[PDB]
Amino acid sequence: DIGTKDKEMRNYLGDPNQPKTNYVNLRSYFTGGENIMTYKKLRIYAITPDDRELLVLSVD
Amino acid sequence: PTDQEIMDAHKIYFADLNFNPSTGNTYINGMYFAPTQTNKEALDYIQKYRVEATLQYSGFKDIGTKDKEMRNYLGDPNQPKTNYVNLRSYFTGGENIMTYKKLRIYAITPDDRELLVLSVD
Amino acid sequence: PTDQEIMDAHKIYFADLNFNPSTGNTYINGMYFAPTQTNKEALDYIQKYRVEATLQYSGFK
């Protein structure tokens, strides 16, 4: 578990024309500077302001 | 923070080294203390990091007490800022601070009591 | 050269390192063997240098 951090609101896909959207940059989480490892497992929980969390992405 | 909550905040570090590609020695420039999920309260409680280290010529010495620096972890512009102890600003005579030889870094609480938080003996 | 002149020609060396400024580990790239006033016969006499070392992953081989 690498922690809880706010979102970032970047342009979609990096396209300067697309609107800005929820961006979750995993380089700022509590990795020890390590790399976050594609096709292996991954889980991202969206945390509502009521402090209840939902599972919104799984890459198991 | 207790005196064990402080010695645990300083458990994961990363030496910022410097390579001299002739006598390939890798002298030390400073230490980061990694930010973890449970140590922000105890890494902010501390400054001044007294250090004693072995310099290249005129070896194991005490090189003084100086505040911390709060640099980005690992130099990554995305990681949070953390306690940085840059040994280039201590009272070295402009000498190099000498890897695998001995080194000791004492964290100095605002109550002026010091704890040993890193040993590279 | 004897087996003692040969082991003495190789007493002064110099690792040619390679620094990686993240996990500042300095891996090895090769070894020089220093030329001295009395070891040109023993150094010219030898080749082939069998080597066994500890690689990063999958170590001492």
From TrEMBL, chain A:
> What is the protein name stated in its UniProt record?
ADP-ribosyltransferase binding component
Q: Which organism is the protein's source?
A: Clostridioides difficile
Q: What is the lineage of its organism?
A: Bacteria, Bacillati, Bacillota, Clostridia, Peptostreptococcales
